[PDB]
Amino acid sequence: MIQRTPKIQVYSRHPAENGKSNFLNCYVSGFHPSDIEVDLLKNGERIEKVEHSDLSFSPDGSFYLLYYTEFTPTEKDEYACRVNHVTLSQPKIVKWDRDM
């Protein structure tokens, strides 16, 4: 058996074809086993509607999860990714840096 804790990155993107649509993204990568719980938070509260994911495996069986959805950030709001995984004894929270 192998267990590997995920690397978590939180960032924002506009599709190059549409600068009017902003997306908040969590990329949760390199993890084993694949069981996981991933949420986006807005001011500490779970965002229930997250419209997209891309889920994949590498040759060594590591998992790669992209979890993302449209949003409209304002300067008062703090966003974050919260992850639970077998490797984490408490939920891991990674805050979004609004420059990213």
Side-chain angles (χ1 to χ4, degrees):
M1 65 173 284
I2 294 168
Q3 42 187 51
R4 287 204 198 130
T5 202
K7 171 64 196 195
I8 302 161
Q9 290 173 268
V10 185
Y11 54 91
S12 68
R13 297 287 184 263
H14 294 262
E17 63 269 32
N18 192 356
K20 289 297 187 293
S21 151
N22 202 176
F23 289 78
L24 177 62
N25 300 76
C26 301
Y27 186 43
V28 182
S29 61
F31 62 96
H32 287 258
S34 59
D35 277 33
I36 202 165
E37 180 179 29
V38 178
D39 282 302
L40 291 168
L41 312 182
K42 179 185 184 185
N43 301 134
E45 301 293 330
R46 182 177 169 269
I47 299 174
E48 301 179 46
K49 184 178 85 270
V50 178
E51 292 292 78
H52 321 280
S53 63
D54 190 82
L55 309 175
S56 63
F57 285 107
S58 56
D60 77 352
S62 305
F63 204 100
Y64 297 84
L65 178 160
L66 184 62
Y67 187 61
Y68 63 107
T69 204
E70 292 96 329
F71 81 142
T72 57
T74 80
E75 281 83 359
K76 83 173 211 293
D77 297 317
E78 187 175 78
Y79 291 86
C81 193
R82 177 183 68 200
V83 175
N84 284 296
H85 182 82
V86 72
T87 57
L88 298 168
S89 60
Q90 60 185 224
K92 185 158 179 52
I93 294 180
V94 178
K95 296 174 179 160
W96 176 53
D97 179 334
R98 77 184 335 57
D99 289 337
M100 301 297 286

